[PDB]
Amino acid sequence: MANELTWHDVLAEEKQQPYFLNTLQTVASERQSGVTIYPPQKDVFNAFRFTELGDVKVVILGQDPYHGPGQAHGLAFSVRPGIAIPPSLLNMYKELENTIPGFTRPNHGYLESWARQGVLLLNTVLTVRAGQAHSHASLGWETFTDKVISLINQHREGVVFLLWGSHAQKKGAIIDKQRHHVLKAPHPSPLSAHRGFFGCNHFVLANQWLEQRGETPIDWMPVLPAES
Numbered sequence: 001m002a003n004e005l006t007w008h009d010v011l012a013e014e015k016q017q018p019y020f021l022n023t024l025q026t027v028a029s030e031r032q033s034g035v036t037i038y039p040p041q042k043d044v045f046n047a048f049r050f051t052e053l054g055d056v057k058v059v060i061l062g063q064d065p066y067h068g069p070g071q072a073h074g075l076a077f078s079v080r081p082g083i084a085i086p087p088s089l090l091n092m093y094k095e096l097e098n099t100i101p102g103f104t105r106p107n108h109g110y111l112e113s114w115a116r117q118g119v120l121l122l123n124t125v126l127t128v129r130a131g132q133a134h135s136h137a138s139l140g141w142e143t144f145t146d147k148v149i150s151l152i153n154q155h156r157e158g159v160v161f162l163l164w165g166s167h168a169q170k171k172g173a174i175i176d177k178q179r180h181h182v183l184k185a186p187h188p189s190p191l192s193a194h195r196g197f198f199g200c201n202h203f204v205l206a207n208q209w210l211e212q213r214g215e216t217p218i219d220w221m222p223v224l225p226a227e228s
C-alpha cells in the first residue's frame with residue numbers, strides 16, 4: 001500500500017549523505033568518460049521502485065549486478081526478457097520445480113512479478129562496469145545497502161530474508177533472528193549449488209512462515225506479459 005512507511009522517509013536521511021553522493025558522482029564521471037556502466041540509471045533503484053518499505057515480505061540479496069549487455073535491470077537475479085537465463089537463476093528455477101509442485105521453468109529471467117509481490121531483490125552493490133566483474137564495489141554501495149537492511153530490520157516485523165552465499169550471510173548478521181525469519185543456504189551458482197542450495201527448500205518454508213502470521217504466500221512462478 002504505503003502501508004506503514006515509504007523508503008523515502010527512512011531514506012530521506014542517507015541519500016543526502018556525503019558517501020552516497022560520491023558514489024553517484026563517481027558513476028557520473030565514468031559514464032561521462034565513456035565507460036559503459038550497467039545497468040542504466042533509470043533502472044538503478046528499481047527494487048525500491050517496486051517493493052515499498054511497508055510491503056516487504058521476503059528479501060533476497062545479490063552482491064554485484066550483471067556486467068553483461070541486456071541482462072541487468074535493478075532487481076537481483078532478474079535478467080530482462082530475451083536475456084538468456086543465468087546459471088544462478090537456472091538452479092533456482094529447478095530447485096523450485098523440485099520443491100514447489102507444478103512449477104515448470106518460466107523461460108524468461110524476468111522476475112518483476114516477484115517484487116510486485118513484496119519481494120525485495122536487492123543487490124548489495126547497485127552498479128558495476130561492463131565486463132569488469134565486481135568493478136564497482138567498495139565505492140560505497142555496500143554502505144548504502146547496509147543501512148537499507150537495518151531499516152527493514154528495525155522498522156519492520158516478521159520479515160523473510162533468504163541468505164544465499166557467505167557474502168550475503170555476512171550482511172544479515174544484524175537482522176534480529178527473533179524479529180525476522182532468516183533462512184540461509186549456499187549460492188545458486190553452478191559451483192555452490194550442489195552442496196547445500198538444491199534441497200534448501202527455501203521457497204516453501206518461506207511461505208509456511210508467511211501463512212503462519214496469516215500473510216499471503218508467494219507465487220514463485222514469474223509472469224511475463226502484463227500490458228503487451
